[PDB]
Enzyme design. Structure first.
Site, short mmCIF file in Angstrom:
data_model
loop_
_atom_site.label_atom_id
_atom_site.label_comp_id
_atom_site.label_asym_id
_atom_site.label_seq_id
_atom_site.Cartn_x
_atom_site.Cartn_y
_atom_site.Cartn_z
N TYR F 90 34.99 34.43 33.22
CA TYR F 90 34.74 33.10 33.77
C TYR F 90 33.25 32.85 33.98
O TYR F 90 32.53 33.72 34.46
CB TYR F 90 35.51 32.91 35.08
CG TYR F 90 35.69 31.46 35.53
CD1 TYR F 90 36.68 30.67 34.98
CD2 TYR F 90 34.89 30.89 36.54
CE1 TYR F 90 36.87 29.36 35.38
CE2 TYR F 90 35.07 29.52 36.94
CZ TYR F 90 36.09 28.79 36.35
OH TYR F 90 36.35 27.48 36.69
N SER F 186 39.44 39.93 33.09
CA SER F 186 39.44 38.76 33.95
C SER F 186 39.95 37.56 33.15
O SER F 186 41.05 37.61 32.59
CB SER F 186 38.07 38.68 34.67
OG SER F 186 38.03 37.76 35.79
N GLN F 187 39.20 36.46 33.10
CA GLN F 187 39.53 35.35 32.24
C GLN F 187 39.78 35.83 30.77
O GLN F 187 40.70 35.36 30.10
CB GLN F 187 38.41 34.28 32.29
CG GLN F 187 38.66 33.12 31.27
CD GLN F 187 37.57 32.09 31.18
OE1 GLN F 187 37.75 30.97 31.64
NE2 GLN F 187 36.44 32.45 30.57
N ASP F 272 41.43 44.54 44.28
CA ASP F 272 40.92 43.37 43.57
C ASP F 272 41.42 42.10 44.22
O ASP F 272 42.59 41.80 44.18
CB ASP F 272 41.35 43.43 42.09
CG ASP F 272 40.65 42.42 41.22
OD1 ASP F 272 40.08 41.45 41.75
OD2 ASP F 272 40.71 42.57 39.97
N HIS F 301 37.35 44.13 41.87
CA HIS F 301 37.40 43.49 40.56
C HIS F 301 36.65 44.19 39.43
O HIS F 301 36.90 43.91 38.25
CB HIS F 301 36.92 42.04 40.67
CG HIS F 301 37.30 41.21 39.48
ND1 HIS F 301 38.59 41.12 39.02
CD2 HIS F 301 36.54 40.44 38.66
CE1 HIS F 301 38.63 40.31 37.98
NE2 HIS F 301 37.40 39.89 37.73
#
Ligand SMILES: [Ca+2]
Ligand SMILES: [Ca+2]
Ligand SMILES: [Ca+2]
Ligand SMILES: [Ca+2]
Ligand SMILES: [Ca+2]
Ligand SMILES: [Ca+2]
Ligand SMILES: [Ca+2]
Ligand SMILES: [Ca+2]
Lengths: 321, 321, 321, 321, 321, 321
Positions: F90, F186-187, F272, F301
């Site tokens: 992101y 992640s994204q 996370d 994360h």
């Protein structure tokens, strides 16, 4: 280092602001409260303490109102002892007798004065406030309680209690009246600074990281509590700015400092964001008696801590020799 | 209230984890350190204190290493006095003799043990650490210093110092050896809890808001310091989880608690996020000697403060009558 | 923009403080460590890397103590290649070979030096510290480890390892000795700056967002870590201020900058609150070799990031043509 | 989502705690205050408002004490209009007439009651508090003012003012007495909930994100203000827990809800950490009159905002048809 | 007080930066959008509002694109009324008609302009944005949307809508065109400032705590949102600094202020960290029409709140007499 | 440990929510975009890179719209190489070719897909978004861009680009089409997870700490960005809850997981709070292909970092043997 550089701090002497009736206001306040008898009461307590004798204290402060305290007498054969009158920081109170063992252990009688209406933040208290009738709109806390008139202001009653507390201490038979010290840090230091100007019985001042100093500058410089209480009141009561600062002028430690004559040891933390160094220095620099300051460049509001406590014992031993 | 409800805390008895050579590790540790002479040294100090005599202490702790301390002896007519061996919280050290006036004022000799390598956070100290050769990769602090092997682990040395400190206190001629108390809060409480199992000279334990307990749970419940030092180490050394927790099992207050037999007063804050209530109750519930706990539902790490100090003095008076 | 305006930063040349034996201290330090053989060892290791050959490095740094590293050799025809000696930021270590692919992919051999005793914050490490006997009272971390004497100070050992790491790099047969670069950011920048003055083998310096510069200013300007470790130590050890800053003067990048003669590319972030711009500019402005600085007005401690990496590749290509 | 799941909230009916004299305490409180004349005064103001007529209100609340307000009358043909009695949230006061234009614009007369002693956090106020003699030790704010005795407690006086405010509104000639609504959010919601049980003149309740509900749960769930005032008091006054929660039982919106019979529209934010959902649902579930609740799953203390305003106007229109 | 002192703010007139085609850019922009018919539509809605008539508004803004709003007409005899054109703060939208009752209540027609593409932060909106083809890489929000070219920049479209909105208001039959006021706070203030320079129909400006002013200074002074959006974009796009500030120069309130001629009332909060005092004073000081500013020394971004609303009503009354 | 216990996480299989036209929505989307030619373009760049050849990529993604990328080809003897298609986190974008050396160094061709409209938070990007006409009201960011209809939703375009990117990678002559891996964290993980179900060319999935999973639970559990964007939109648009979650159901990685058949390596961090463990495990547990998960109990994360990179290289080597 959020404040003025040390070289500027040592020369910092802002123009003072006070009303022309500052002295008469205090003269009247004290005279009115003197019309009620001090009536000091010392009541020996049962305690597990073995090196100290503890007393429950009651005396009349502002307008005859009865204020609590402790008296701690170290068990020593000297028949007259030196004495420290100890004032307490914001949201504190007199707690237990064993919270105040320092001065007794150094051979001084200790008179701890309870703070009216507080005693609920970090150490318990047992003394109420008694207002002048209506308790006006205020921001949570003690800084804006009655702030719209100096006669109704919270600290008028606290300062009067504090002057009377030295008269109470002095009434105790074993107290040497030539060696009565007034002592405090933070709010206690601002209280003590007022007592240094208003009391006739105090012989020395210990003033650490003092609060109640240079209000107009304090409120512009930091957003910490308790100064933030004033700022918040002013954010809402936008028509009341001149009145707020007029009232506070009667209680500002810088204006009492300019009238104080007794010897003083101050302390300051250069990274103190509760009592900023510029406000502390304004009061020190105007202080009109013989004076010293211990400067702690890397300390916040803890100041010199136990190092300063050593400084204070050494300062008073030398002073009273 | 971030932890288990109080009804569950009162029953909380998690499965214990220790290696089968736990006792053997501690027997060897103590036996190796006992081959060096204690060599206790008490040197009376020039001091402004008047109700107490203060001594500079040195004794041999872990592997003959020299550990500093203070001994405070209140000036009383009784020829043998009860004694409190005081351990100190994380990042603290022995400070000044006047930082420890509580117990002497209550008529107890007080032996304050300095903490090797710390003394730089909130109270100064004077005692170095002396590592087992190489000082492995670690996260800043004392929690992960030598953590890859229990023989190199920081607290093996601290706990040995602490057992030896009770022997040094006991060597003082004015100490009543039937009334030696071991005391601490936070890190001090976890040190004391180790001593309660490893020392033969201690007669009572005062254990407040103890640290060094139930490490596996502590590290999953809170992100505060100092437990966060272990978590941060594990975040990096992702291959070393089993080894870290194996080492920490030898120093866990819950496994010492299971072996301690002397009377104890514990305290706990139910909103304590430094030493969570479940880690303190895990230790308390396994504690194998006669025991009481004072529970402070609305307090964080400050625990019962001066209220608990009163409880401790009453507790010990009644115990020793 | 919390620091001096850029036009002031570009002229910032504060009065330098060092002891008269600064040079002797370093001459003696290096002479003593040179008495132990370097004994550099390069051990080709099994790896999934295909474009690079990876070696496990061991060499003798401070006082013969054995320090780990990686050597990454790109698979290229050229028989002699340029080389970057890479130093690592605070709480990092050598990690895995694949953490350091940038320079090899640009056709440079890369010598990564592991940092003694760290490697537990953001990237694992494998090299222990070995103290000069007693490990004094300290605040958590590396900044105040042995800080009461420059001979016992943590960075005396790190800087000596770092000078020896260039000598180990240069011993590798494929390394072109006329094109040896020293490189680092943050703590790595401060290490590299020391090496730029103490090494005879280094030919260029890359110094990004340097740490370990202008300590007295750093500690009054910012409350971030790692500089806050020093402040926190000073808050406690209030008697130790002069000693702390005397020690630190021997490890200050501003004092090394004044003696460095090799060409350098610096970088600075004007919103960097870890390594403030005034501390970096103090070092840059005193830097005595041919020099450039890339200035990133809107960046914090990330600095120029990948943009700066492009700048470094272009800088070195032009320098070595 | 920090609180109980929605399915559990909708069934949440915790055991209620109140003293056996709850009802007589309130009967006596009201009876004593009714012995002073209401003496309501409506004084038409110069205003720039064109669609509304504004009046300065004064009426006698607790023990004849004079409370300020505003009355806003929309300029409409209708000879008798419906009325909303509006209570104000914590640290607010009556402000200016133009701060309350919503209900007038919807065709309702609006009686705004000023909050004694507050008016200094987010909107100005003009009404003092007048204590029952001594103002006991307290934590900064209103929550612990007089908390050691229900007879001295701040909210006894506020709730009695609030019941008398409905009588004042009803005395205005253009007010339709069959359509008097009591309304508030937060503190105003808790005041309105007390009035729903104590007043005989109120016909409908609007109760948004209510404060002053389920105190024992509020204080163990959240550390936000204003509930944190009580917790902070209890942290220091460790001997006063039973007294504190006894006093608060007389003022708990859950205990008033159990007695209220008029129709109500509630609102709740499921992510509200000032007035947690479980405390609001405890009050709603015990509410004994015809009732509805609007649930806002993703909102914090803002609740339904302007969406909820729409719901309220629709709810009242339907109710009164 | 984080910004320049008040005495300096009163004289603060930084060198302005704009491109030579500033005026030409705006002339072309407006000319191109004027080629589409305004086609204003006012549609009376069903509402519970009784003192106001509420209309759904649609008009053509930038390039014929259809923008929503509300019109609130107070129910008054007067056949022509004065009118306030109201712009909305960041992340807001037109909401419900009952969110805008102030100006109608004071006898003014109120045209509320919805903000294209926002309406999702604190008040709902119903108007989309329509970009100039490709939506370039941007940081989350509106501040950096199209920022690489003034023709593609988000606020080109917003400012054009806002100029067209005054023409729509003016087309309403009951609007007195000699008394059309443009009004906003924060983003609304910046929008209104652009309209004060670009519109021919506006007769007075109300400009509170204005945003979109002195971008270069804003971005180096504060790290709050929304100005932090620009800084974050610049942190990444380190090659785009000159282009970003070039674009922003066309939209800067300081540059529009220099061209505005109509009378204005400004306000400022000296502790405003969202729209710093220096950026607001830069715009005020360059403002070229008759002007006043109300200064609120102790307020943050709330500014003068309801106090300022009273000032605005009194200012306009006097102006239009 | 803020989420469900690990034993519960391993069994966590919440009821899935999707519309009956989920599959047809995606079939139509892909079919529509396939009507435009892919038109892949690879242009070799002048670079300082020596071990890798770097290409500027352009290909047609959603609706013929042109998307940037990098292709990194390691200089090796093998004529066909395995390939990793890398998706970006992101606020990131394709950056510089030297930002992606990991896979090339391990002998894999690496296709880096630029993320439309982003590239402004932590790494620069060069690809714009092109909306479906009007850009509706939204909260700052990409999560709520077009969220009121799946047809207009941002991630419809991103996921289509991503499916097309595998086709562009496969067009490159030196790519072994039997060893094409899709990869992201992640994204990037959520994008890759969609591609695992929608692409026919992908042979293995690397899915770290995946975002875009179990939206309804994510938004209840954490207040971190970017999930908080959805919550904040819902806080304002209180009428749009059902529509928001309906739209999101078409883009939920749990729903794609249930349809994916290729071998997969997942990773998760138990602490996370950006991508909570329950949301990752919901996707993992429904994943319908052969699968493994690496669990990192103490990581937030950052997940497994370089440890996980080693696991990925081992995983793929074994898979393709
Ligand atoms: Ca006078
Ligand atoms: Ca055994
Ligand atoms: Ca020399
Ligand atoms: Ca090896
Ligand atoms: Ca009853
Ligand atoms: Ca021109
Ligand atoms: Ca319509
Ligand atoms: Ca289907």
């Amino acid at each position: 280092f959020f404040d003025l550089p040390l070289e500027e701090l040592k020369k910092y002497r802002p123009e003072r602001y006070e009303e022309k009736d500052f002295d008469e206001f205090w003269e009247e306040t004290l005279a009115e409260s003197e019309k009620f008898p001090l009536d000091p009461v010392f009541e020996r307590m049962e305690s597990h303490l073995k090196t100290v004798e503890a007393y429950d204290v009651t005396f009349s402060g502002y307008r005859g109102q009865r204020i609590k305290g402790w008296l701690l007498v170290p068990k020593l054969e000297e028949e007259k002892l030196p004495c420290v009158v100890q004032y307490i920081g914001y949201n504190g109170g007199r707690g237990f007798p064993h919270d105040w063992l320092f001065w007794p252990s150094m051979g001084y009688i200790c008179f701890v004065m309870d703070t009216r209406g507080q005693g609920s933040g970090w150490l318990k208290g047992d003394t109420p406030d008694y207002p002048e009738g209506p308790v006006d709109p205020q921001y949570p806390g003690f800084m804006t309680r009655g702030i719209l008139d100096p006669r109704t202001y919270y600290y008028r009653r606290v300062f009067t209690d504090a002057v009377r507390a030295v008269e109470a201490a002095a009434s105790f038979p074993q107290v040497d009246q030539e060696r009565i010290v007034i002592a405090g840090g933070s709010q206690g230091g601002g209280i003590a600074l007022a007592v240094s100007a208003l009391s006739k019985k105090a012989k020395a001042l210990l003033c650490d990281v003092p609060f109640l100093c240079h209000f107009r500058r304090a409120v512009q410089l930091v957003d910490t509590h308790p100064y933030a209480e004033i700022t918040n009141f002013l954010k809402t009561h936008r028509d009341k700015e001149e009145i707020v600062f007029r009232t506070l002028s009667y209680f500002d430690g810088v204006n009492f400092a300019a009238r104080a004559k007794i010897p003083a040891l101050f302390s300051v933390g250069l990274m103190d964001n509760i009592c900023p160094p510029s406000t502390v220095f304004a009061a020190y620099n105007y202080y009109a008696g013989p004076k010293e300051i211990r400067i702690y460049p890397y300390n916040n509001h803890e100041g010199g801590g136990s190092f300063q406590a050593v400084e204070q014992v050494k300062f008073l031993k030398k002073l009273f020799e």
